[PDB]
């Protein structure tokens with residue numbers, strides 16, 4: 001199959017204002033449904049949904065990616081790697097119902113951007129234009145990463161998504177959000193204390209906590225601290241590899257730098273595989289509910 005080209009196509013007649021309204025609806029529901037997952041809220045799962053719907057991309061043939069919004073098809077939403085994301089999709093259902101004009105890919109990705117910003121993270125420029133593609137364009141399961149591997153695995157894995165060392169380490173800071181759930185992934189526990197506030201806590205915890213390699217109730221190894229935090233073997237690999245370690249230390253000591261680098265890497269992740277016409281609108285930077293006094 002020849003390398004497909006996905007050209008961004010703006011939803012008919014829509015502009016910044018239309019998308020800010022969708023952002024707002026998502027942000028308002030995030031505030032409303034705050035009891036989810038023992039009051040962590042839907043922020044983390046929406047970020048993970050944005051990542052997993054974008055992370056199926058393969059730079060070699062442009063298959064997968066955020067463009068098609070293929071997670072709406074059974075093969076992909078039933079991917080074992082996506083266990084638990086159905087909660088995020090259900091959250092977005094009423095949003096898509098109110099704004100039926102937005103594409104699935106635009107909604108999934110915008111959900112992640114909205115969550116990060118509302119959780120006090122950096123502003124993440126976002127571009128519209130993803131177009132829904134047929135069920136036969138859904139990528140096969142197995143493109144998302146395993147968590148029981150080492151640094152070499154992580155480095156090699158992300159090369160498929162065209163991410164370098166700094167981009168990988170910056171992206172990983174998102175694990176400051178939410179937690180692992182034994183029933184979903186075979187891992188259990190949060191990475192930090194501020195589960196629904198976007199900060200550089202992930203890096204400080206990796207470096208400052210005293211970690212012990214233990215077996216959880218699913219008989220899988222994970223690193224645990226007496227504080228009640230955990231790290232996946234892939235997370236811990238960031239301090240085992242000397243190159244990753246240097247970057248982890250940088251972000252643990254510069255919140256602004258982490259925010260700026262994460263913003264760039266996350267937008268890149270959400271845009272991989274998409275060709276934006278020269279005359280396409282500039283990226284949108286949405287105002288938070290707080291900035292709008294809403």
Ligand code: HIF
Pocket residue numbers: 044045047048051083084145146147154171172173174175177178179180181182183184185186187232234
């Ligand atoms: C090395 C690559 C990665 C691996 C192996 C990996 C494994 C897991 N990630 Fe995660 N991840 C991102 C966001 C989030 C978020 C948010 C969650 C929390 C979900 C929740 O419902 O709380 C979240 C949960 C989990 C879980 C637990 C799922 C569950 O049990 O519910 C696993 C096992 N992740 C990213 O954005 C990204 C790219 C950077 C940090 C990124 C990279 C990797 N992630």
